[PDB]
Write a protein that binds this ligand. Structure first.
Ligand SMILES: Cc1cc2nc3c(=O)[nH]c(=O)nc-3n(C[C@H](O)[C@H](O)[C@H](O)COP(=O)(O)O)c2cc1C
Ligand SMILES: Cc1cc2nc3c(=O)[nH]c(=O)nc-3n(C[C@H](O)[C@H](O)[C@H](O)COP(=O)(O)O)c2cc1C
Ligand SMILES: OC[C@H]1O[C@H](O)[C@H](O)[C@@H](O)[C@@H]1O
Ligand SMILES: OC[C@H]1O[C@H](O)[C@H](O)[C@@H](O)[C@@H]1O
Lengths: 393, 393
């Protein structure tokens, strides 16, 4: 593989699970704790991760997971992290369903300027029906319309980001000419979902414009991403389903005129790395055991895994399934390597809900990849595009 | 006066003027320059300013002032500054006319958590008619409706901020009870302008909720501010008009049940402080002279000031009127003191467009006020409410 592998670090505060917070190692306030977020981001930056990633949602109930009940908004925390990090990209989830594209176009570009070219947007059409009810609507649009809207939203957002050319801001104190009037472009969009005259009140960043990520996994979703995205997040249920998605998407991107190396595909994994197989397994177990089994049985009570498993352990493994990427550094490194060479992945988003994981990944797994020529020895540069391998538009 | 005087620092990048950027001392890129913003904020924090202030607008044309053409968005830059500052409040201008209150309620509270209780919102109904056309509307609502909407917006925003009680987040790892279900309040707003079910997905901050500022100067505006605001910005055309406004507003606040010391009134000044009267005056002049007089005459060509002024100097003084707060430290200190004792001001927002001003104010003027018992010797605490003198709701 000509290219290197890449990593992004998802920072999800107190984690993606109903009871993982109960572990002794976990700060149950992590989700609103600036320190937690800073240390993580600096660890990822130490491991030369290309970006940190913040996921997001806009609706809760009292049965939502603890993280979702009380956490940072994405652009605030990324902007804060911007000032205490040097090269790592800053990618954040924003819905096309609720915000005005001007508002968002601005906040992302502003981030991009603050950070000297490290912004990314995880564009998300947004699934929670109750979200509508937090934003003065009755209901979400139906799924297909959702993606129609997103196309228009993005197109406006990208239009605005091109309000100014890279060299518009001339700043001639002698002539009193601040900017070149020819290099300023009014969008004048009057579309179906949005009307936006422009121009945007901030110009081009050291990487041009932020990088687009996209999560979408449906037929519609893959097409959209294949068409519009610089990078795609996907799941990692298995090597083969992930090889499939990769194939399909890189194909559809060719069908849209695009060079497929221009689209980077990033499945999400949460490695549990330890010095021995039995330590890693301990850790898995401490966490899997945190759920009250009473809960766990029920959600089970709506595969063949008679592997000497008791009902309890099967109820537990449902609550908190075990990653393939468990165990020794070389095992984890090796899977990661195999997935890459198989063309299931161009890189991975690393979750690190369990305490120590992110730190252990960076410390033990990265050096191996570096040492086998699979991962760089230092940051390519200071923008998210340089580091990702993408060209400035 | 029982209370001390207070200051906020407006940071306006390359300034509020058409040609001030042309001065040799001015970085014409200041408006998108994170370094500029950081140094300013740290200077203000060194002078124990209660807050920094970022103004904002959402519409431009090619005849807009250079700052407005290309600058940071407010919540991004405040969030960035949050991580490099320790006690100074972080106040930002946000319109009620375009954003959804959930979006904003979140971003402000998130800021509040990041900063450990230093957020403020300058609530602004927003005047630029073309702004509507950047946010998929034909036109602004008429002025009165504008303030009806703002009342609902704010009320929702404050409702959401009360989604959780200060002690809701119990975090009992032993009992598996993350939060107290009784302490979680669904807003369920179905108003005229907005419908918002809630609850907000982030809870109470170390100062409860952010502080409300408000600029409004009309009959409607004063009433609104008097009713809703923790602090009010106003102009400083003259001592007497500012005494009037102060009077009127503190009065109307009594008419709304409120203790008027609970409302803090902050006129905006841009002092030009120097070691001698003639140096300060030089500086004024270098800047006033930057405008091409050709421009300057015209805007004149639609007072009695035969003060040996040539037409040129009158055209110039229109372009860039001279502050009362020009000259020596003790003069500036003394005016500031007189305005305070006259009850025109409880504090001031300090603009510092001219290079050195903010630095000179902090260095030369503050010590005098400190030394005459008018200004504290250190920060009262770490929240914007402590420092302002306000109680947590
Ligand atoms: C790494 C990764 C991150 C995701 N982050 C979010 C998120 O932040 N917010 C959200 O609403 N959905 C998120 N999703 C879920 C997607 O919305 C989902 O996988 C899928 O694409 C559903 O959309 P579709 O029906 O259009 O394809 C994420 C998915 C992946 C795999
Ligand atoms: C210190 C100060 C800051 C202001 N900042 C803004 C601003 O950031 N954005 C804006 O649109 N108007 C701003 N204004 C202008 C107000 O909108 C204006 O003074 C006035 O209240 C007009 O509103 P009204 O007709 O409702 O009273 C500011 C005013 C003052 C005095
Ligand atoms: O809040 C709900 C959402 O937010 C999270 O951040 C998740 O990653 C996403 O899959 C979920 O839909
Ligand atoms: O952008 C236009 C607006 O933005 C500025 O930040 C100003 O303070 C405000 O008075 C003006 O209305």
């Amino acid at each position: 593989r000509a290219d290197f592998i890449q990593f992004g670090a998802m920072i999800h505060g107190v984690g993606g699970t109903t009871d993982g917070w109960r572990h002794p190692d976990v700060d149950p306030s992590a989700s609103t704790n600036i320190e937690f977020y800073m240390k993580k981001a600096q660890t990822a930056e130490k491991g030369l991760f290309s970006f940190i990633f913040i996921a997001d949602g806009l609706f809760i109930s009292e049965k939502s997971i603890p993280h979702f009940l009380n956490r940072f908004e994405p652009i605030t925390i990324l902007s804060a992290l911007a000032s205490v990090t040097k090269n790592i990209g800053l990618v954040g989830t924003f819905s096309t369903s609720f915000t005005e594209p001007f508002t968002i176009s601005r906040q992302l570009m502003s981030l991009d300027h603050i950070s000297g070219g490290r912004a990314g947007w995880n564009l998300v059409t947004s699934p929670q029906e109750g979200a509508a009810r937090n934003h003065s609507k009755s209901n979400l649009p139906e799924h297909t319309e959702r993606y129609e809207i997103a196309q228009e939203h993005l197109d406006v957002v990208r239009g605005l980001w091109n309000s100014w050319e890279h060299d518009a801001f001339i700043h001639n104190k002698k002539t009193g000419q601040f900017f070149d009037q020819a290099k300023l472009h009014r969008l004048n969009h009057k579309g179906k979902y949005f009307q936006v005259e422009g121009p945007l009140n901030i110009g081009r960043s050291k990487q041009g414009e932020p990088v687009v990520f996209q999560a979408g996994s449906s037929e519609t979703g893959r097409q959209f991403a294949a068409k519009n995205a610089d990078a795609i997040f996907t799941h990692s249920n298995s090597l083969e389903e992930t090889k499939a998605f990769y194939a399909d998407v890189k194909s559809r991107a060719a069908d849209e005129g695009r060079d497929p190396s221009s689209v980077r595909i990033f499945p999400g994994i949460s490695p549990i790395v330890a010095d021995t197989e039995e330590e890693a397994e301990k850790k898995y177990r401490e966490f899997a055991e945190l759920i009250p089994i009473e809960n766990a049985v029920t959600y089970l009570a709506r595969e063949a895994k008679a592997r000497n498993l008791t009902l309890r352990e099967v109820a537990q493994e449902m609550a908190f399934p075990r990653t393939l990427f468990i165990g020794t550094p070389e095992r984890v490194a090796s899977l990661i390597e195999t997935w890459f060479n198989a063309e299931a992945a161009d890189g991975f988003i690393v979750g690190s809900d369990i305490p120590g994981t992110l730190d252990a990944f960076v410390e033990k797994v990265i050096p191996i990849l570096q040492e086998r020529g699979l991962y760089r020895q230092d940051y390519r540069g200071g923008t998210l595009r340089e580091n990702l391998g993408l060209g400035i538009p």
